[PDB]
Every structure is written in C-alpha cells, then in structure tokens.
From a paper:
We previously determined the crystal structure of the C-terminal 73-residue fragment of PhBCCP (PhBCCPΔN76) that represents the biotinyl(/lipoyl attachment) domain of the hypothetical methylmalonyl-CoA decarboxylase γ chain. In this work, we used the C-terminal 70-residue fragment of PhBCCP (PhBCCPΔ[name]) as the template to prevent the N-terminal heterogeneity that was observed in PhBCCPΔN76.
The isoleucine mutant (A138I) and the tyrosine mutant ([name]) conferring residue 138 with the highest crystal-packing propensities for β-sheet provided better crystallization scores when compared with other constructs, including the wild type. The A138I mutant and the [name] mutant produced another orthorhombic crystal form belonging to space group C2221 and a trigonal crystal form belonging to space group P3121, respectively. The crystal structures of the A138I and [name] mutants were determined at resolutions of 1.9 and 1.5 Å, respectively. In these mutant crystals the crystal-packing interface involving residue 138 differs completely from those of the other two crystal forms. Neither the C orthorhombic nor the trigonal crystals could be obtained with the wild-type protein. Therefore, it is conceivable that the substitution of Ala by Ile/Tyr with a better crystal-packing propensity created novel packing interfaces. The numbers of nonpolar interactions normalized by the total buried ASA for the three crystal forms were calculated as 0.108 Å−2 for the wild type, 0.099 Å−2 for the A138I mutant and 0.135 Å−2 for the [name] mutant. The order of the normalized number of nonpolar interactions corresponds to that of the resolution.
Author numbering: 79 to 149
The structure:
C-alpha cells in the first residue's frame, strides 16, 4: 500500500531532506515548508521507503499537492 504525503498548507519548499530510496521513520522530516512565517518540517506518516520526490527546493506548493510518495 504505497501512500502519498501531500502539502497540508500552501508554502515554499525550502529544503528536501530525503533522497529517492531512503528508508524513513514515522515522524521523520521529509522536507521543510516555508509557511505562516515559519519553517515547517513535513513528516512521514509511517515507516517506509521514499519512492518518489515530486517537488524541488524553491518550488511553491498548495494544499493537497502531492510532495512525496512512499513505496
């Protein structure tokens, strides 16, 4: 059951913290989203493997936009 991490709010991708193929833990930061005058680390919802990274540093995203797919 692959699943997708989508943006919970609009903002700018400031940093991507993982690479395709990385093992991740639940709660691990996948990227940093600039929003509400803060940096916001967007978490993995579960243990797994990063299958796809769908955004790049510098990119603006909106709510519901797919960011990361887990395998």
């Amino acid at each position: 059951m692959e699943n997708v991490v989508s943006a919970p709010m609009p903002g700018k991708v400031l940093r991507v913290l993982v690479r395709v193929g990385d093992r991740v833990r639940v709660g691990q930061g996948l990227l940093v989203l600039e929003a509400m005058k803060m940096e916001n680390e967007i978490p993995s919802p579960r243990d797994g493997v990063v299958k796809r990274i769908l955004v790049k540093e510098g990119e603006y995203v909106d709510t519901g936009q797919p960011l990361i797919e887990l395998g």
